[PDB]
């Protein structure tokens, strides 16, 4: 459907790396190519929807 | 609930006396009932209102678009983890207000004990929480009894004569 | 964050009248109750009076015998402690404190003084003294050669006769701060404070290097200086 | 159980008296004590029997096709939550039925404390639930102390003159 | 805590009396109310760490490789009935032992009633746990209100001349 003018969409999907993995990706078509990573930290962090301002 | 009436002009603390003597009267509120209570009750705020909380990462609990099973089975849990809370909401709640009414009745049934092992010969009870002393009883009087510094061999021999007679 | 300021003190003669105050900030006072603990030079603490919220219970030590006077206001959130026929044992450092009311960690219901007094303030100096200021009489000491095998000799200054305390002694204008021992004040037949400061020193630089004890009075703006030889 | 025994042929209420004088025996249910411990009881049944059940759309629980994981996740929820709901089910009942004894003790200690408060210089205790009346009691002084419309002082004068004689 | 403390050398039971006259002194624990104490006590034990555990099949609570909502899912499921766990630990042990010092506050007020249904005329208590008796006690007198054999008609006429005289 017609969404911000255009008629196409690209599908999302995730790859977690652990340490000492080798990431290979092999494509032929249709592919998004990374320009980086992110670092997985751990804490007691999460999200939520909210319509509040800040103070 | 036999205690007839409390005190409303007694602002000062939660338990006291009102003594009635040849000197005039008042209320003065005792200092050793008072806070054995506040100890028992304050406890049992500070384990469920402080340091009762959890810091986790959570899942999304609201959703707009409908996925399917994935979508029902969260919801299950949730609404489910939700009543349980509220289930034992209402059996901690509703327990500590009923625990509370005896705590209240406990602590005025350690003061009627300890009022108790000091007028066994020198005093009775009158029916609405009042004790009848049957001896001259003086400010002093009245704050041995506040302090628990009231002895019972020095009234003896003034209140059984006008107990029984 | 809950902190207690004291203000009312100064120098006052033995037979006046003065009014202390407790500046409360951080939390409610009218919930909390207050006291009046001192602390008097040479012994231990002392309780006064207390009082609570509804004011309507009020205590008094056996040393107050009702010359004192303790208020409180819930609009002004301070205490008045009135202070009637003192004398020179009153002479001490005054303080307030908050009762803590119960026996856990956060107190939601304030009880009484039970357990403990977990809040304490600064302080205010109120001294009693019908002696009035006076600067300090600087009095050198000459030193002399009394270890033989170590080859020392100590000196210092003698300050004497002075009001109110303290003084700050330095030497050199606190280039010398090394072995310099600072005693404190002690009282004397007329009323008046006397301390001394003295630094050690080897004997070989008696008669070369220059001791200056720098003596500087604050309310009185009095600097005698008296060189050490 | 200080009670040796109760009463099989009072079937008119929970508590009651046993009167015994020259005027015959009998038993009368008391009004006040068995009304006042009903309120406590059908006050437990209400909020738990009643009005809280959950109307809402559930999962399905049981399953024929073995599937995997998504059958496995919901299979470990469910039968967590009839444990926690029997766990709960033993914490809930199990201690109403033990402060119900709790609750028919305090009734008897309170019926105790009105026979108590009124029987001070007239009565004593026997040690099976009984008083010893050291006095002339009829059947109207038996409703006296039933209805809590007893006096002390009327009869001040008859039981202290055989209690410690 | 009226009891102003107890005896660390009778370690035969967990209740007892200490009595003294002229034939010694001594301790010696009670076969009454100890066994009946134990009976509650180990009772809340075998219906909590006996035959309360769970046998079945439980799911991969740890995961090493993460996925994403599939264990986003479990892991929220785990984490509450673990705190679900630990808040009916904290709900249930802390009654417990909430419930076992009324318990033994119980059994010390059965115990001062069983000595008070045979000391009404007899003794009176003396505000530390003890009770004054006013005749001649033998050991035979203590082993009787130990084992409830005591008579109160025997002894009534020795006391009562010196209680109030």
């Known amino acids: 459907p017609w969404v911000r003018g255009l008629s196409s969409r690209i599908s999302i999907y995730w790859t977690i790396v652990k340490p000492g993995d080798v990431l290979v990706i092999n494509s032929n078509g249709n592919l998004i190519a990374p320009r980086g990573y992110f670092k997985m930290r751990t804490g007691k962090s999460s999200i939520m929807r909210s319509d509040a301002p800040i103070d | 609930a036999f205690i007839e009436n409390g005190w409303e002009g007694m602002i000062d603390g939660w338990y006291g006396f009102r003594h009635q003597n040849s000197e005039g009267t008042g209320q003065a509120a005792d200092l050793k009932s008072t806070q054995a209570a506040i100890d028992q009750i304050n406890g049992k705020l500070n384990r469920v209102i402080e340091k009762t909380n959890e810091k986790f990462h959570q899942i999304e609990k609201e959703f707009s678009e409908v996925e399917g099973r994935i979508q029902d089975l969260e919801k299950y849990v949730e609404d489910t983890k939700i009543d349980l809370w509220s289930y034992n909401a209402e059996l901690l709640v509703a327990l500590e207000n009923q625990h509370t009414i005896d705590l209240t009745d406990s602590e005025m049934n350690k003061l009627f004990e300890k009022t108790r092992r000091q007028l066994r010969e020198n005093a009775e009870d009158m029916g609405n929480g009042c004790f009848k002393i049957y001896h001259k009883c003086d400010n002093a009087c009245i704050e041995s009894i506040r302090n628990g510094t009231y002895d019972h061999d020095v009234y003896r021999d003034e209140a059984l004569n006008n107990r029984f007679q | 964050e809950v902190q207690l300021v004291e203000s009312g003190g100064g120098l006052v003669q033995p037979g006046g009248s003065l009014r202390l105050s407790c500046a409360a900030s951080?939390?409610?006072?009218?919930?909390?109750?207050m006291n009046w603990v001192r602390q008097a030079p040479g012994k231990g603490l002392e309780w006064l009076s207390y009082?609570?919220?509804?004011?309507?219970?009020?205590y008094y030590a056996d040393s107050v015998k009702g010359r004192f006077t303790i208020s409180r206001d819930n609009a002004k959130n301070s205490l008045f402690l009135q202070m009637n026929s003192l004398r020179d044992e009153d002479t001490a450092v005054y303080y307030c404190?908050?009762?803590?009311?119960?026996?856990?960690?956060?107190?939601?219901?304030?009880?009484?003084?039970?357990?403990?007094?977990?809040?304490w303030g600064q302080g205010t100096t109120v001294t009693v003294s019908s002696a009035s200021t006076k600067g300090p009489s600087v009095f050198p000491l000459a030193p002399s050669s009394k270890s033989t095998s170590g080859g020392t000799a100590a000196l210092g200054c003698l300050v004497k006769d002075y009001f109110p305390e303290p003084v700050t002694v330095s030497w050199n204008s606190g280039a010398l701060t090394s072995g310099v021992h600072t005693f404190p004040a002690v009282l004397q037949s007329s009323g008046l404070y006397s301390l001394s400061s003295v630094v050690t020193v080897p004997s070989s630089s008696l008669g070369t290097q220059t001791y200056i004890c720098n003596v500087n009075h604050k309310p009185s703006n009095t600097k005698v200086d008296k060189k050490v030889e | 159980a200080f009670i040796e025994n109760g009463w099989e042929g009072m079937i008119d209420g929970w508590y009651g008296f046993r009167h015994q004088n020259s005027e015959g025996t009998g038993q009368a249910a008391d009004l006040k004590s068995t009304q006042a411990a009903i309120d406590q009881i059908n006050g437990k049944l209400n909020r738990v029997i009643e009005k809280t059940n959950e109307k809402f759309h559930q999962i399905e629980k049981e399953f024929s096709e073995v599937e995997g994981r998504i059958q496995d996740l919901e299979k470990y929820v469910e039968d967590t939550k009839i444990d926690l709901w029997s766990y709960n089910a033993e914490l809930l009942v199990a201690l109403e039925n033990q402060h119900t004894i709790d609750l028919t003790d305090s009734e008897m200690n309170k019926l105790f404390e009105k026979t108590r408060r009124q029987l001070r210089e007239n009565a004593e205790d026997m040690g099976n639930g009984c008083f010893k009346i050291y006095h002339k009691c009829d059947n109207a002084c038996i409703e006296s102390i039933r209805n809590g419309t007893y006096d002390h002082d009327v009869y001040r004068d008859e039981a202290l003159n055989n209690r410690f004689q | 805590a009226f009891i102003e403390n107890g005896w660390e050398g009778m370690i035969d039971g967990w209740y007892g009396f200490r009595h003294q006259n002229s034939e010694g002194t001594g301790q010696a624990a009670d076969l009454k109310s100890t066994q009946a104490a134990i009976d509650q006590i180990n009772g809340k034990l075998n219906r909590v760490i006996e035959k309360t555990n769970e046998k079945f099949h439980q799911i991969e609570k740890e995961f090493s490789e993460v996925e994403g909502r599939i264990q986003d899912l479990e892991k929220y499921v785990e984490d509450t009935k673990i705190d679900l766990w630990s808040y009916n630990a904290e709900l249930l042990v802390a009654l417990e032992n909430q419930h076992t010092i009324d318990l033994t506050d119980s059994e010390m007020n059965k115990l001062f009633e069983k000595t008070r249904r045979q000391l009404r005329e007899n003794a009176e208590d003396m505000g530390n746990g003890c009770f004054k008796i006013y005749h001649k006690c033998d050991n035979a007198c203590i082993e009787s209100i130990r084992n409830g054999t005591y008579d109160h008609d025997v002894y009534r006429d020795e006391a009562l001349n010196n209680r109030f005289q």
């Open positions: 404190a908050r009762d803590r009311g119960c026996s856990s960690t956060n107190c939601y219901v304030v009880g009484y003084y039970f357990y403990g007094m977990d809040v």
């Open positions: 009082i609570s919220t509804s004011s309507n219970t009020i």
């Open positions: 951080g939390f409610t006072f009218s919930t909390y109750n």
